[PDB]
Ligand binder design. Structure first.
Ligand SMILES: *[C@](O)(c1nnc(C(C)(C)C)o1)[C@@H]1C[C@H](F)CN1C(=O)CNC(C)(C)CO
Ligand SMILES: *[C@](O)(c1nnc(C(C)(C)C)o1)[C@@H]1C[C@H](F)CN1C(=O)CNC(C)(C)CO
Lengths: 728, 728
């Protein structure tokens, strides 16, 4: 009777989920765009004003990609001519509009092709990288002090990371951290010189007579890693006549003995900074706290203020040693680390005392520290109801670690179980982002007493619509293995009738510290598979997953492609027997790492899976980047972990692919997971004689995100599924 | 009740077709392998002795790829460590074995990596190329004299051709030529300095961590072509003076005005040589005839011995100007050219007279000249029975051109309609090679009387096995269009019932001067398709095809992607009318040029075809080599033929693929028809949202000939056809 959620309704967005993005400018005011017109809001009463009429640059001349208003607000950065690079980088052109004299500054502007630009944390100082060199501008109109002169495309990187640091280390192109008030501009420096390059044809338009060869400095497992350096410079003291002096802050002694990385930078006080260094063998990292010696002009870091973070069960941190959170005075910070039972809780640190006193504990973890006042530390965790897939805001009274208060748990247990937050300047007010299991709910709150000012968004619209369409249902339950529970979720169809046999598709990622089984609400391909194709889509976080302790997450240390593969199978099998699933119709697909698990599984021999799609998979580990791979796999050497590197390969299981219908997809311009990886699978599948399906995607990346290529890649996949499950 | 000719039978070569490849080493003795051991047959009697016992090179310690015995029968060149490259090029290791002292020359040895070798056509001189440089050896066991010191990788080629000459002109790697008695050594030299480079990647073996990039000098339509220079060195005068000297021969100035190519190099006497020059605009070529001047020491080419050959309807020659065959005294030659009617025939030339005289004429074409003795000239043509898809040896008397005898026609008329021959050194003997339409037959004959000596291979053994298998039949008739008849051929299933409707797969090539319709017996994929899946398989030689006159071949000059396409469709429409063709099941599939027409045909919007397959097709002409693309397309400039270039891509007919089922397949290391070509097709379909089937082939070339891939590509295609025709 009622329509179902169709693939068309997905690739098109017939049903758009409402958000509420606001940016706190003061400790009680945030900006919010509404109808291209940016308004300013008073978090208390909720009144607002037209900060910037949507018509202001009604004849700017260019399409304005994005805007950043200077800390004090006396200016508003203007981004255009945007051109995406990797996951976080891009080059764009800017323009600064003096929000006072209503003038689009013109004397001395930011060069075209600017790699990254940033205001100071206070006032209106700008900082930007162009041609790999850092430039500073005290005034929007005044020329700019070229801080560095080593910039040289693909070799030296000042203030911007390289391929590897941007992806696997700083999840950002940027690499320069202003100081609190904007006196010191710190910045990292990367020298890719002896780093091997990955090279791939790019075919551009249809007119490019000869395909171009994209060549990026990218280190693969065991390769030659990029070098790094940290410098700091006083922005207040820069001669227009002379060249800045950036004072280097060398890495420690245990860190310089071998290949290393700069894993995290954080300012403590207007004169103190803390640096965390990670060893190429990522089970050891050291945080330095450098103070500024007014006299010497240099920066000193008293080893008696040095701290160590290591691991005997695996690597350090979740994906990287967590960042610290200093007190106002800077004599102590709070930092998330794993206790002696393998969980990650919050630890209290005296900058010059060797031991840290955890303020939380239990068989749950801390997702992240979100706010630190003098009486409270607010954080997000999955403590509530013992479900690792739900997150909630809490606050612990710094003066009495037993007076914890969950500010979100009971807000609406039915609709909400997964929270995210935003705190204004001095954590005066805060917005709670409820993203599931029910439709998203955005609400603003105040710290003084945790009173719920008002509701900013409730997707009522969406809601009203979705009641005319048979949406699927979700079940988050679990299974006990070895007395340990591993969670899973199933997207069930409408009218799901347990007296029947529904084919099932296992949705897998199964990477390290991943979590595919949670409480969030989603409008995705599966919503369609479940709703229109009556296909149960599962997902399972088994040995390997995170947010549940090291015993599980580290379970795969050095053994990638083992237990997490075997555990996917297990759940399947177990599912395979629940009466409502048709064990002659069980598929499994994956993207990225999932594609890798999807592949390793289809090549397992389990005869549990009929078919399977692997998108942008990883064939073997020696083909991936160093930082990620080695973190979990170690070094590709006989003296280290070559056998498992060699054992972990998809290729060596090619012949087992004979008992499964398989589909391979990759985007020829993938800079993350090289086409080279699938390209290597298929050749192996051809030499053993297994027939299978394949499809490449010209010039698409690890995202196959271009619109047309997106609608096409799903349209192709569904067809592959329906054919496998024999659906009309 | 007998089994059919199955797909496996095709891939596994179960029904082996025999043959008899021999190499004349004299006027009465030829060499043949006969169970691993070169024998020496005597044509006059057939008796025979072991020339090279198979168990000779047993303790060699390498797998020999081929042997080359020196003209005098005094040595033998063992070739090993074979390493292919392009169509014909390849690199190897060599070793000479002194047949007489039955020993293996160990001093002054041929360099590993020799790109080319060649015995002098008399005695035992050796000239090999190694590192783009020529080297001569008067004695197998003495040092080499270097002939050229300009050799340089990917820049200057001496004695070997670059990519475009190796494929589109000479059809061979070797770019040197020995004089009749091997006193001189002529050789072309190529300079691809400013020739762009095609850059594709080669993933290698699974152990290659980083993908290699193949970069090769390749001139695409319109781009910068490689220039050429010709020289001749006297090999006998190397032992007396110092360094060697090479006398250069420069192309006539009618060529020097612009870009030009060297298309032919034919020695006429001991001191007379002909060269043929074609202009980048291949519709006008010239032939210089050059003598060796003993008093100047240089090569003199009298302009009065200059011959022009041009076409006003198209280009010159089938693919390139045909070659001459001089009479002993090198004062006159015979050469196939296009008469006044437009048919290719043997004209008679007096080196210093500009008008030649045809010695054959009519509405058929002489295929090639096979031998020229003092009394007769021998040629192959498709005259017999006015069947163009035919081939027969003919004899013409030089004293009386009215006295023509067809030496093969009536030998066995039902079994043999496609001949090919191999004359002895002076033409005293010859071997005819029946290639169909019955099973291939090889006989031997005496020239003096044209009486058949004996039978070499009659494939009786294969004929027995086949009695016990459902083989498909072949019909070769024609249809009529605009008064002109266009020949076709169908492969028909066993027990073909013209009262039934059979599904039809159109096999196509359509390239200019292509002949897909003929009387040749073959055991290929179609065999299986007709013998196992009861699918009628046809091919059509329409406008553009050759061997029927320039009025049919030159029909598409400057207009590729039109007539030959519009026609292939009509033929489908002609076939369906016949009444045993399932209009609902008609598919087309090509490869290379064919692949291009297949693709054009499905976007045609002709609603004629259901599904189709295009292996390694050309998508647009500007992505293809200049020598070939420009020969039928002109130059992609607006002053020339740009309009039709842009007006004949597959990419623009993307929206029309919606009405059919596509399947694009391409090797990723296709140096000939780059991957670039399908990657632009897919991207063009994906952009209009057209679903299709793809399948790439890691490191396969334009021949996807890898044993496993060969078996893979055909198995995968088989399935596509099956479902396309839901047989199953
Ligand atoms: C792959 O797993 C990948 N790419 N993006 C993603 C998610 C997390 C699904 C968005 O997964 C790819 C292949 C390896 F498995 C690791 N990897 C990465 O992209 C690594 N990148 C992050 C997101 C883990 C951190 O840079
Ligand atoms: C394509 O036609 C091709 N390559 N090999 C072959 C056959 C003869 C089927 C084995 O077809 C390809 C694309 C263009 F049509 C031209 N071309 C060539 O390889 C070059 N054409 C020749 C064969 C006339 C010269 O090498």
């Amino acid at each position: 009777t009622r329509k179902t959620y169709t693939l068309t309704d997905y690739l098109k967005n017939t049903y758009r989920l409402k958000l509420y993005s606001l940016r706190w400018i003061s400790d009680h005011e945030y900006l919010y765009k509404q109808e291209n017109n940016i308004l300013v809001f008073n978090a208390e009463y909720g009144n607002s004003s037209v900060f910037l009429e949507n018509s202001t640059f009604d004849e700017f001349g260019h399409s304005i990609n994005d805007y950043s208003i200077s800390p004090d607000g006396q200016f508003i950065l203007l981004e255009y001519n945007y051109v995406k690079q990797w996951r976080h980088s891009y080059t764009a052109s800017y323009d600064i509009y003096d929000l006072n004299k209503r003038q689009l500054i013109t004397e001395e502007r930011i060069p075209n092709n600017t790699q990254w630009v940033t205001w100071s944390p206070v006032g209106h100082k700008l900082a930007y990288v162009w041609n790999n060199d850092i430039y500073v501008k005290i005034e929007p109109n005044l020329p700019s002090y070229r801080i560095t002169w080593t910039g040289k495309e693909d070799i030296i990187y000042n203030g911007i990371t390289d391929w590897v640091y941007e992806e696997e280390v700083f999840s950002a192109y940027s690499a320069l951290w202003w100081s609190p008030n904007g006196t010191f501009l710190a910045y990292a420096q990367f020298n890719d010189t002896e780093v091997p390059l990955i090279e791939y044809s790019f075919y551009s338009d249809e007119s490019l007579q000869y395909p171009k060869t994209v060549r990026v400095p990218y280190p693969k497992a065991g390769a030659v890693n990029p070098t790094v350096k940290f410098f700091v410079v006083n922005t207040d003291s820069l001669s227009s006549v002379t060249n800045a002096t950036s004072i280097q802050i060398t890495a420690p002694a245990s860190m310089l003995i071998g290949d290393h990385y700069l894993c995290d930078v954080t300012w403590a006080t207007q004169e103190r900074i803390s640096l965390q260094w990670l060893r190429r063998i990522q089970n050891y990292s050291v945080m330095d706290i450098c103070d500024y010696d007014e006299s010497s002009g240099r920066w000193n870091c008293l080893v008696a203020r040095q701290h160590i973070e290591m691991s005997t069960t695996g690597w350090v941190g979740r994906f990287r040693p967590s960042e610290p959170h200093f007190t106002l005075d800077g004599n102590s910070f709070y930092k998330i680390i794993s206790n002696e039972e393998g969980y990650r809780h919050i630890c209290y640190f005296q900058i010059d005392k060797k031991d840290c006193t955890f303020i939380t504990k239990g068989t749950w973890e801390v997702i992240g520290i979100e706010a630190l006042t003098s009486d409270y530390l607010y954080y997000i965790s999955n403590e509530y109801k013992g479900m690792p897939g739900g997150r909630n805001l809490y606050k612990i009274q710094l003066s009495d670690y037993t007076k914890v208060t969950c500010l979100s748990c009971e807000l609406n247990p039915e609709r909400c179980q997964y929270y995210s937050v935003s705190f204004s300047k001095e954590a005066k007010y805060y917005q709670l982002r409820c993203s599931g299991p029910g439709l998203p709910l955005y609400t603003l709150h105040s710290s003084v007493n945790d009173k719920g000012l008002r509701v900013l968004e409730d997707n009522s619209a969406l809601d009203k619509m979705l009641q005319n369409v048979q949406m699927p249902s979700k079940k988050l339950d679990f299974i006990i293995l070895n007395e340990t529970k591993f969670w899973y979720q199933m997207i069930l169809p409408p009218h799901f009738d347990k007296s029947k046999k529904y084919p099932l598709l296992l949705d897998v990622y199964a990477g390290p510290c991943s979590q595919k089984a949670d409480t969030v609400f989603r409008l995705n391909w599966a919503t369609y598979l479940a709703s229109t194709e009556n296909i149960i889509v599962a997902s399972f976080d088994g040995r390997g997953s995170g947010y549940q302790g090291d015993k599980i997450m580290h379970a795969i240390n050095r053994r990638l492609g083992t237990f997490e593969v075997e555990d996917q199978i297990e759940a399947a099998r177990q599912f395979s027997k629940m009466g409502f699933v048709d064990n002659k119709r069980i598929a499994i697909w994956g993207w990225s790492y999932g594609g890798y698990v999807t592949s390793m599984v289809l090549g397992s021999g389990s005869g549990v899976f009929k078919c399977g799609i692997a998108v942008a998979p990883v064939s073997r580990w020696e083909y991936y980047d160093s930082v990620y791979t080695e973190r979990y796999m170690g070094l590709p050497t006989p003296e280290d972990n070559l056998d498992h590197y060699r054992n972990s390969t998809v290729m060596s299981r090619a012949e087992n692919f004979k008992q499964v219908e398989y589909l391979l997809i990759h985007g020829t311009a993938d800079d993350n997971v090289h086409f080279q990886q699938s390209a290597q699978i298929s050749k192996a599948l051809v030499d053993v004689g297994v027939d299978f399906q394949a499809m490449w995607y010209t010039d698409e990346d690890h995202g196959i995100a271009s619109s047309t290529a997106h609608q096409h890649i799903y349209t192709h996949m569904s067809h592959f599924i329906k054919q496998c499950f024999s659906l009309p």
